[PDB]
Design a protein around this ligand. Structure first.
Ligand SMILES: Cc1cc2c(cc1C)N(C[C@H](O)[C@H](O)[C@H](O)COP(=O)(O)OP(=O)(O)OC[C@H]1O[C@@H](n3cnc4c(N)ncnc43)[C@H](O)[C@@H]1O)c1[nH]c(=O)[nH]c(=O)c1N2
Length: 459
């Protein structure tokens, strides 16, 4: 049982907590990072499964994510682009598989125009409302008390268009059904990425990856922090008063002046607070939940789809696997596909045995890229739902109505206790870039709090 004294304790060694920790040390404050798992990285994790390197969690970098990109440059990390040559596959409402190129689905002209209409409206809302305080906008209550499902249908009678547009947010981002989150929540997602248009473009949101894996972002920061990072040490209790904390984890107890809960909001209540958090937090914390998505990994002897002039990209609002992409590692001679099974469809397939689920998922992928898909050398499902220190994927969002109700307090410190994760971010919301931005912003706030306590207040 280590017994440490530090300026700041950070709960969780994901990218948010680790970024905050480095920024704190840089500002002259000592830190300790207490991590539950036997590794750093949190929702980012590179592992080798039966001889195949896979990114089990977060991996994509988009062009809006300049903060993450600066960090990559500082860490000496390099990026590469997802393969996108050739034709993509779309399976529409008419059940027809059609290959295509360009920035437009091969849909009828009415559906194409309805999609453009919806996207333009959403782009305008995102620009008006912004990703920082969506809850504060005059349109917040209107937009946050109707589901995205119903909002779409108030604005278009075209079911195929509505389902496609829903796909980019529901299955694509929040990993919850469109009837379970609000239009305002969709607008926040869009604003956080620079526009709704950006979310519709896989060449934007799924543009690049980090050579060697996204987990390096955490691994390298942790290596630099040395044994200020304690692994296999879940935080159980935070005793606090107005002036500091004693944080009790399984392998270390740390006395400090501040603590950062650098964990997804659904896991806040895993920590006992003495005294309890205020009623506001007690309530707010219950109204948040992670989505659910199965990240499917299939490795083949070669990227077979390229032989047929396909990019490996596939979309279908109606399929079991709604999205598939080329996810071949930089320099690999084998080929890797990644597919996504979201929310209620994930529930459904989790009903099946592992064997039957694999079969159904591969058959769905074959629907896009052909029967070679049926027989990978390695098949693996990211299973973040089973992880007690995550419990879902990709990220947390409020229940319907919760964003405009609680958003204004999501960043509020409780005395010495701060909250920091990608789930709370504006730009980069729910993504590693957001995690990094939040780590930086929270460290800055603590630095400023420290400065106010140490510099005599002006007359
Ligand atoms: C499968 C799927 C795929 C993707 C992604 C995730 C998931 C799993 N995402 C999202 C993404 O990775 C995520 O936003 C960040 O990893 C979050 O960083 P945080 O540090 O904020 O939380 P994160 O969950 O990563 O870290 C929190 C940490 O605290 C720990 N912890 C929790 N409670 C604790 C306790 N009581 N005591 C001690 N430790 C505790 C955990 O074990 C963990 O390491 C993504 N993002 C992106 O930019 N591009 C992408 O392509 C993807 N794709």
């Amino acid at each position: 049982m280590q017994n440490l004294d530090r300026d700041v304790v950070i709960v969780g060694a994901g990218p948010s907590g680790l970024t905050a920790a480095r920024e704190l040390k840089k500002a002259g404050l000592s830190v300790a990072v207490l991590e539950a798992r036997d590794r750093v990285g949190g929702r980012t994790w590179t592992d080798t499964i039966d001889g195949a390197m896979l990114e089990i969690g977060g991996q994509w970098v988009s062009p809006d994510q300049t903060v993450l990109m600066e960090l990559l440059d500082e860490l000496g990390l390099k990026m590469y682009s997802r393969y996108r040559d050739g034709e993509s596959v779309y399976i529409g409402a008419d059940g027809k598989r059609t290959q295509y190129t360009g920035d437009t689905f091969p849909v009828n002209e009415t559906t194409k125009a309805e999609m453009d209409k919806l996207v333009a409206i959403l782009d305008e809302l995102a620009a008006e409302i912004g990703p920082t305080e969506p809850w504060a906008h005059p349109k917040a209550r209107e937009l946050d008390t109707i589901s995205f499902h119903h909002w779409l249908r108030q604005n278009s009678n075209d079911e195929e268009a509505c389902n496609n547009i829903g796909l980019f947010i529901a299955g694509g981002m929040l990993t919850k059904p469109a009837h379970a989150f609000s239009a305002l929540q969709a607008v926040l997602m869009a604003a956080s990425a620079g526009s709704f248009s950006h979310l519709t473009d896989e060449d934007f949101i799924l543009d690049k990856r980090v050579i060697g894996g996204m987990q390096q972002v955490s691994l390298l920061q942790a290596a630099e922090l040395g044994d200020d990072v304690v692994l296999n040490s879940p935080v159980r209790t935070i005793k606090w008063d107005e002036n500091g904390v004693s944080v009790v984890s399984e392998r270390a107890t740390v006395n400090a002046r501040f603590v950062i809960m650098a964990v997804p909001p659904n896991l806040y209540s895993r920590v006992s607070f003495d005294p309890p958090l205020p009623r506001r937090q007690h309530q707010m914390h219950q109204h948040q939940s992670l989505g659910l998505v199965i990240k499917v990994h299939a490795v083949y002897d070669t990227p077979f789809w390229r032989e047929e002039g396909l990019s490996g990209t596939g979309f279908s609002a109606g399929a079991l696997v709604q999205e598939v992409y080329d996810n071949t590692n930089h320099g690999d001679s084998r080929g890797t596909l990644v597919g996504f099974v979201s929310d209620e469809k994930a529930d459904a397939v989790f009903e099946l045995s592992a064997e039957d689920r694999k079969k159904a998922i591969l058959e769905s992928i074959a629907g896009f890229l052909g029967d070679k898909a049926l027989t990978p050398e390695v098949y693996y499902e990211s299973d973040w739902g089973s992880e007690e220190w995550t419990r879902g994927a990709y990220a947390s969002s409020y229940d319907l109505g919760g964003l405009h109700r609680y958003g204004k307090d999501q960043h509020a410190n409780v005395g010495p206790i701060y909250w920091s994760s990608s789930d709370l971010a504006a730009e980069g919301y729910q993504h590693v870039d957001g995690a990094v931005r939040m780590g930086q912003a929270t460290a800055a706030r603590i630095v400023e709090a420290n400065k106010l306590a140490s510099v005599p207040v002006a007359a």
